[PDB]
Amino acid sequence: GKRPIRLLPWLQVVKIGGRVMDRGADAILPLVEELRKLLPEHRLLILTGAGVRARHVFSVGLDLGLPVGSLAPLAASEAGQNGHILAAMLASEGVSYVEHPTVADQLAIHLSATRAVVGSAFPPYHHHEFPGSRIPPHRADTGAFLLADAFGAAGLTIVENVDGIYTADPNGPDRGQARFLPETSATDLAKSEGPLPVDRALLDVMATARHIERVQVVNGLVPGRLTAALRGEHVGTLIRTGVRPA
Amino acid sequence: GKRPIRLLPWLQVVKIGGRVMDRGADAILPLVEELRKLLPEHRLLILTGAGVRARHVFSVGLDLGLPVGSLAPLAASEAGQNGHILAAMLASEGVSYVEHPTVADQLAIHLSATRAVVGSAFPPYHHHEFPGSRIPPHRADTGAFLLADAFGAAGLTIVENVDGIYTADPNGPDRGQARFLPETSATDLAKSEGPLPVDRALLDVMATARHIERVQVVNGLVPGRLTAALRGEHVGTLIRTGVRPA
Amino acid sequence: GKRPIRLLPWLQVVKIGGRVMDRGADAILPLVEELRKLLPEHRLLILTGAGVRARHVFSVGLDLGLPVGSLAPLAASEAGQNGHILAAMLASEGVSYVEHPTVADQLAIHLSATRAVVGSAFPPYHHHEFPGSRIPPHRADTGAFLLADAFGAAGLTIVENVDGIYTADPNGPDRGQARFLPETSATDLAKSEGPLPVDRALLDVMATARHIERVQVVNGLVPGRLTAALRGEHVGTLIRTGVRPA
Amino acid sequence: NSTAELEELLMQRSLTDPQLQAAAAAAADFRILPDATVIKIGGQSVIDRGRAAVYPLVDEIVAARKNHKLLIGTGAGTRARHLYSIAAGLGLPAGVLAQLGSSVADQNAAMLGQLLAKHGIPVVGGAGLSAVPLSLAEVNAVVFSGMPPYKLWMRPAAEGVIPPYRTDAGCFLLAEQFGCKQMIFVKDEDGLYTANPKTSKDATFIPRISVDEMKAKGLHDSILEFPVLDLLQSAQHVREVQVVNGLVPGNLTRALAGEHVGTIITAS
Amino acid sequence: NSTAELEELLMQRSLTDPQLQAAAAAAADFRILPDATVIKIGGQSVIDRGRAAVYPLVDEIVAARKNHKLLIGTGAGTRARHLYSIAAGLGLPAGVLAQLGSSVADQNAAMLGQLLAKHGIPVVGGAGLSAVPLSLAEVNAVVFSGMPPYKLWMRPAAEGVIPPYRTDAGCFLLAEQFGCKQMIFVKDEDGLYTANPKTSKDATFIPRISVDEMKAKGLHDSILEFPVLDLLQSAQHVREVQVVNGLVPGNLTRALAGEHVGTIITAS
Amino acid sequence: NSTAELEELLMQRSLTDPQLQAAAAAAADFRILPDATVIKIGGQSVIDRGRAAVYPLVDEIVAARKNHKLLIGTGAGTRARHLYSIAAGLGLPAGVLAQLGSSVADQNAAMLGQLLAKHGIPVVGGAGLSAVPLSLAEVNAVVFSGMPPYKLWMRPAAEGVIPPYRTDAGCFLLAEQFGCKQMIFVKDEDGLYTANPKTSKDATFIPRISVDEMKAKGLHDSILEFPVLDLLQSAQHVREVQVVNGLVPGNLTRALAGEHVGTIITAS
Ligand SMILES: Nc1ncnc2c1ncn2[C@@H]1O[C@H](COP(=O)(O)OP(=O)(O)OP(=O)(O)O)[C@@H](O)[C@H]1O
Ligand SMILES: Nc1ncnc2c1ncn2[C@@H]1O[C@H](COP(=O)(O)OP(=O)(O)OP(=O)(O)O)[C@@H](O)[C@H]1O
Ligand SMILES: Nc1ncnc2c1ncn2[C@@H]1O[C@H](COP(=O)(O)OP(=O)(O)OP(=O)(O)O)[C@@H](O)[C@H]1O
Ligand SMILES: [Mg+2]
Ligand SMILES: [Mg+2]
Ligand SMILES: [Mg+2]
Ligand SMILES: [W+6]
Ligand SMILES: [W+6]
Ligand SMILES: [W+6]
Ligand SMILES: [W+6]
Ligand SMILES: [W+6]
Ligand SMILES: [W+6]
Ligand SMILES: [W+6]
Ligand SMILES: [W+6]
Ligand SMILES: [W+6]
Ligand SMILES: [W+6]
Ligand SMILES: [W+6]
Ligand SMILES: [W+6]
Ligand SMILES: [W+6]
Ligand SMILES: [W+6]
Ligand SMILES: [W+6]
Ligand SMILES: [W+6]
Ligand SMILES: [W+6]
Ligand SMILES: [W+6]
Ligand SMILES: [W+6]
Ligand SMILES: [W+6]
Ligand SMILES: [W+6]
Ligand SMILES: [W+6]
Ligand SMILES: [W+6]
Ligand SMILES: [W+6]
Ligand SMILES: [W+6]
Ligand SMILES: [W+6]
Ligand SMILES: [W+6]
Ligand SMILES: [W+6]
Ligand SMILES: [W+6]
Ligand SMILES: [W+6]
Ligand SMILES: [W+6]
Ligand SMILES: [W+6]
Ligand SMILES: [W+6]
Ligand SMILES: [W+6]
Ligand SMILES: [W+6]
Ligand SMILES: [W+6]
Ligand SMILES: [W+6]
Ligand SMILES: [W+6]
Ligand SMILES: [W+6]
Numbered sequence A, B, C: 001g002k003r004p005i006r007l008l009p010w011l012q013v014v015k016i017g018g019r020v021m022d023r024g025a026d027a028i029l030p031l032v033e034e035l036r037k038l039l040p041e042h043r044l045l046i047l048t049g050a051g052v053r054a055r056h057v058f059s060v061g062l063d064l065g066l067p068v069g070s071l072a073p074l075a076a077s078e079a080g081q082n083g084h085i086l087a088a089m090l091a092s093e094g095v096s097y098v099e100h101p102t103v104a105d106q107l108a109i110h111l112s113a114t115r116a117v118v119g120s121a122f123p124p125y126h127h128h129e130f131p132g133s134r135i136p137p138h139r140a141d142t143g144a145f146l147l148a149d150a151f152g153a154a155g156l157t158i159v160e161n162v163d164g165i166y167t168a169d170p171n172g173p174d175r176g177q178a179r180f181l182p183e184t185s186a187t188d189l190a191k192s193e194g195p196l197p198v199d200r201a202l203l204d205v206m207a208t209a210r211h212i213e214r215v216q217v218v219n220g221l222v223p224g225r226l227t228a229a230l231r232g233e234h235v236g237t238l239i240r241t242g243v244r245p246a
Numbered sequence D, E, F: 001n002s003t004a005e006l007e008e009l010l011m012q013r014s015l016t017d018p019q020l021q022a023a024a025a026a027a028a029d030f031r032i033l034p035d036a037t038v039i040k041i042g043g044q045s046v047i048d049r050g051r052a053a054v055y056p057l058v059d060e061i062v063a064a065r066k067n068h069k070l071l072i073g074t075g076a077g078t079r080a081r082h083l084y085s086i087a088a089g090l091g092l093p094a095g096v097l098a099q100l101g102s103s104v105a106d107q108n109a110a111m112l113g114q115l116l117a118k119h120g121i122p123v124v125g126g127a128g129l130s131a132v133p134l135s136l137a138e139v140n141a142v143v144f145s146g147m148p149p150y151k152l153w154m155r156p157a158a159e160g161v162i163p164p165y166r167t168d169a170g171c172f173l174l175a176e177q178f179g180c181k182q183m184i185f186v187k188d189e190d191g192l193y194t195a196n197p198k199t200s201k202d203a204t205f206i207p208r209i210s211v212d213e214m215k216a217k218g219l220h221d222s223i224l225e226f227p228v229l230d231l232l233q234s235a236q237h238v239r240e241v242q243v244v245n246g247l248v249p250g251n252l253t254r255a256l257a258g259e260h261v262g263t264i265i266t267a268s
């Protein structure tokens, strides 16, 4: 479709939910062991989300009246911290955390040096976050997708603390009526109201995407799901972005 | 001649003229394909020049009365942009753009990580550019040579949009009387008046050089010339710097 | 002992005394040749001390009345300069100097790219140096140990211009009564008064160490001692830190 | 809608939960720099034209900062168009083009800053903001590069690879984020017309219009292009903008004095 | 103890030599910012409590900088405790936790800075110092993040992996290094008590005490924890500190005016 | 020589074309900081001498900035000579030595800055320039490190590996680039002599001389060495420099007041 070239067609991008990291060692150690075993199989950019500490900083910032552009970098910092924690656990395998400018400009050389690098999933919108909601809309799912698609990566897998997307929050008030969605499209999700385990802005950037045709959301609390998802096995919710092949 | 040691004796430095980049895809895609094929053969520092956008910024800056030290970093930025464009095209081969401090201090580790890196050919003279001309004298040819010689590189090849040096601008008013120079010396060039396809300051830094004995200027619009030049084949204009072997 | 994990258990840390560097080529060239031969055998973080130029900057700073927090970064800069000199000598082997933030966050990827990197041994305490002495207490031995132990490195070897620790300064007024100590403990050293070839603060950080059980101080002016020390051979003074195995 | 209810929702729901979104919308609204005006000095429209356009505006800025706190952002212009043409021709995506354009806006800010330096006015880069210069009567202004920082994470347009959020958007978002009182775009036409005034000898001048009206009139005069107009409709703090001709002596000075020169574009 | 004798020792001895150490101790003592007061705004104790605690203190800072030069450092608080819990649970060492906590103190400084920006007061990061803002009557204050820069080179505590030198230590060391006249810690209790006043309905207030007395009384009320108290005993310039309750309207203003609110802790 | 002819040449010729060079030479000449004086405080000649030399000059700078805008650059000195000796002995090239010397000039600037901080005068590093401090009456001065930024791209001398462009050159080029009104080098001799006054008990003082005359007299007194003297002959804005003895109480103050202390060296 005359689309832009893929910059890193061999790259697999993996976004790790900040609420997975927030579970601490019980979740992180099995995830690290699974990532270790994946290093020889894939060339990975592992991007971390923010999780509960961003909620706390939002609670303070909103109480101080701060605008959405003030809150964005404050949440981004939490995703960075999670990336530093994860990279520390993988340091002995040669993995380090890299900052945004390095991800933006020097990822190819870093993935030549080593099999995986970790970075923040939040995009550097910061004080130029868009207005409208008091909650920064371009968060970790959105940033990871923007990067994956800009690079023309072989995939983006979103690793969450739930099996995938349900028809309602499976940890919420309406938990009883939450039905699992094995497959959905971004456009179908965009026209539903209600919470999701992914940013709403992710659906918007899926609409303008040029390369990534599907993103799978999988439960990183179940060993082996991330491995399976990276081989294309259907083990969580597939989201079709509406990109079609050339 | 008691000269300084060579820091990176195995390095090949390739300067790509900004006016080659300014030709866009028609020039850049064949050049990228040739560079791709060179990656397994040589350890390359690829440095880009500035080209026409630096002329535009000079036109504005000079119209605003700005001094030569103001114009220098403004032209350097254009060479950086060209380096970012070129590196993007080679990202899937593991090549990234590296900034000046990294080139100055960390090139050895970067060339251990990957087969080539791209950087700006302009030197970081910036507001400390020398006075005298209203046009910054230490430009891309000069910066690439300074680096190549400081490193004691195995070579510097200058990739231009012309076959080499002529006795007059082969795209100029006196184009009719322009005769091709297969070989020349920096000192012979320095004592001629008239335009050249290389900075005049390059001749001055050739005079104080410690290692690089010859620099070849070749037409990067002809596939295969850069490959040949990197093997020492005479396919453009050889400039003898006046360095002699120890 | 429920201790923290080792981040880079395979790393060997080598601290090179600034007074070794101050001997110039006569000391540095044999040391570089020995380091070259070590690159295929070990994964090395080589950290340089400051030496005599830090004494000069202390003399000026103290004459200007500057506090210990002012003097700390001024001495650190000298250790950085020595690291840049050493890395230049090893550039052709792929070794570069890396700055503190890179050592702190990105060492694993750098040691994936290349076999050794050089950095400053001084820690980034700077204006937050502790008060009490007018001489910055957290110097190169201390910084190198802090890093080695934080990483859980396989070792730290301190390369000095003397055989090891004596009972008095073997280049001092009481040189006549200086007896060589093949082995000592940090606690025994901490309770002696008198000069040492290592920072006193090194003994304090040895007391709170979690991993490094012994540090050997060896004479880098004798070819082959650093090689032997890195294989665990006893060729200088072993300092027992008081860490015991788990 | 207390702190407590908001904090509970923040802890227990996804940020996408409509209930949490609604509770956050009820938060207090602090304006960080409420007494500043953000001005964008056009790249193609002003700076690329050199001394004849830039010198009078420098004099205006110097005069104006006596009475008005200014954040002065720069456009990118012809060199960015050149970069975008080369990169688009290579098949590079919007995120790569976005970094290229940032460099050109930065060159322009450097040039403008050098003309303003002797007047005390700095070029700033992290916090465009810059609290110290903005607070001094001797200063009361700063210059910044207008491109947003999105780089590789730039949102693409629906079609094509030209970054949609460029220096008008970057300046607008700074005004919006800092809660500035006024946003003035300084370009090379008197304001908005019913058609592009360069390619039509018939366009009618529009002194005031809403974004909805511009869309409904099917306006294609992209003196301000749509991405910034959509941002304007979502804005909390800056709900109208003014477009003025920087080529007219004193127009900036007059707009800062509350004169209705140019076109006022309202969110609603 | 001349320059000459000191310079000889500096050249010819190890820095560990007791003779060189003694000669250096006799050097002149320059105070870099002798007229500044360093204040720490608590993370958990103040900033984490939001508007009710922070707004009045912002008003105090704005009022106070009219008469007093201030370096205002921030604490870290609950988010750092969360990070420390996760990282400690993974077996990460103190040097890794130290970097995590720095980020939280930086977030807090960014929030406080945004509330102060319109008053001209910047957030600074390299030289906390910042010579220009500190010297202007219009400014006379700066905000900085309180964590020390030790990162991976953090000295561990004797037990456990929680970094011992956190934001109280970072602010104290800045006051000490710059030779500031006063160090005020602004937290959420009136000062030091004979017991923790949150977990004891019986603690007795202590208006003034030395570090030795706190140790001898076996004080566990860690409104200030021991690592900063040991630094205080070694300090050249700042030989006492004041702990005040930032939640009480005007307490900071009053402490800056020389009123003996809270607890004065002396080195000896 | 219009904009148009210049723009045509700029588009269509090599920058090396004598016609384009001539057209560019006819451009207007804007001075960025025309009312500033650049002063270099000697490294070996002043700062390395410690308090006896530096304290009086700090007092001079503080007094002087009341009437004069100052950009104060530092020399490098003995530690750089040490680094150059070690590195030259290893066979390192001038570009490597250049980075080493920069570090020493930076240490000196940090020391001088710490003595000046309480007076509001900052150390600056990017834009030496620094527009805000330079414009304030309370400030009106900044300190910067004198080494040029050439690093690995340093031009070598004709012989040897010692970088030819060091801190005199760096300060001179800043004065020249910013179009400053005056350049004063502050060293440890009263000025230029017919011989080196340290190694000759007979040298004659020279109050005023041109670079051509220094060359023709075959002057070897390298109080200022030739690379900066050649730069001076090419300069557009600063066409003479003054060398003064910073060790003489008030000499800097007097030179800033227009007194002809020391030696004036002219381009022609
Ligand atoms: N429709 C839904 N399907 C599945 N989960 C949902 C849905 N709506 C809300 N959720 C909630 O989303 C939670 C995931 O929370 P969230 O997505 O914020 O965390 P995260 O992705 O780990 O954080 P971050 O975005 O910072 O990385 C799930 O645990 C679930 O409770
Ligand atoms: N004597 C000459 N021989 C060959 N080319 C010449 C000569 N004199 C002028 N030129 C012109 O130099 C042109 C190359 O332009 P120039 O060297 O500025 O571009 P570049 O090297 O690509 O740019 P940059 O220096 O920014 O990398 C040739 O196309 C030719 O027209
Ligand atoms: N008890 C001792 N045993 C051995 N050497 C001693 C002792 N006391 C003092 N010294 C001196 O310590 C000297 C080493 O000096 P020092 O340790 O400062 O240098 P360095 O380690 O090279 O410098 P840096 O700490 O900057 O790296 C030895 O040469 C010796 O003269
Ligand atoms: Mg999620
Ligand atoms: Mg050329
Ligand atoms: Mg030692
Ligand atoms: W981040
Ligand atoms: W981060
Ligand atoms: W980051
Ligand atoms: W970053
Ligand atoms: W960031
Ligand atoms: W920001
Ligand atoms: W931003
Ligand atoms: W550049
Ligand atoms: W660049
Ligand atoms: W660059
Ligand atoms: W750079
Ligand atoms: W640059
Ligand atoms: W510059
Ligand atoms: W510069
Ligand atoms: W350092
Ligand atoms: W350094
Ligand atoms: W460093
Ligand atoms: W550093
Ligand atoms: W450093
Ligand atoms: W510092
Ligand atoms: W510091
Ligand atoms: W930019
Ligand atoms: W600039
Ligand atoms: W700039
Ligand atoms: W700034
Ligand atoms: W700055
Ligand atoms: W910013
Ligand atoms: W910004
Ligand atoms: W900002
Ligand atoms: W910022
Ligand atoms: W900003
Ligand atoms: W700033
Ligand atoms: W500022
Ligand atoms: W500023
Ligand atoms: W910008
Ligand atoms: W920080
Ligand atoms: W911020
Ligand atoms: W900030
Ligand atoms: W600052």
Ligand SMILES: [W+6]
Pocket (backbone or CB within 6 Å): none
């Ligand atoms: W700044």
Ligand SMILES: [W+6]
Pocket (backbone or CB within 6 Å): C127, E125, E126, E127, E128
């Ligand atoms: W600092």
Ligand SMILES: [W+6]
Pocket (backbone or CB within 6 Å): C127, E125, E126, E127, E128, E149
């Ligand atoms: W600091």
Ligand SMILES: [W+6]
Pocket (backbone or CB within 6 Å): C127, E126, E127, E128, E129
């Ligand atoms: W500082």
Ligand SMILES: [W+6]
Pocket (backbone or CB within 6 Å): E126, E127, E128
């Ligand atoms: W600093």
Ligand SMILES: [W+6]
Pocket (backbone or CB within 6 Å): C127, E126, E127, E128, E129, E174
């Ligand atoms: W500081």
Ligand SMILES: [W+6]
Pocket (backbone or CB within 6 Å): E130
């Ligand atoms: W600053």
Ligand SMILES: [W+6]
Pocket (backbone or CB within 6 Å): E130, E131, E132, E133, F122
């Ligand atoms: W400042």
Ligand SMILES: [W+6]
Pocket (backbone or CB within 6 Å): D132, D133, E132, E133, F132, F133
């Ligand atoms: W400032």
Ligand SMILES: [W+6]
Pocket (backbone or CB within 6 Å): D132, E122, E124, E130, E132, E133
């Ligand atoms: W500032």
Ligand SMILES: [W+6]
Pocket (backbone or CB within 6 Å): E102, E105, E106, E144, E145, E146, E147
């Ligand atoms: W901080």
Ligand SMILES: [W+6]
Pocket (backbone or CB within 6 Å): F102, F103, F106, F145
């Ligand atoms: W420097």
Ligand SMILES: [W+6]
Pocket (backbone or CB within 6 Å): C073, F110
């Ligand atoms: W410093």
Ligand SMILES: [W+6]
Pocket (backbone or CB within 6 Å): F109, F110, F113, F123
């Ligand atoms: W400094």
Ligand SMILES: [W+6]
Pocket (backbone or CB within 6 Å): F123, F124, F125
């Ligand atoms: W600054």
Ligand SMILES: [W+6]
Pocket (backbone or CB within 6 Å): none
């Ligand atoms: W700054």
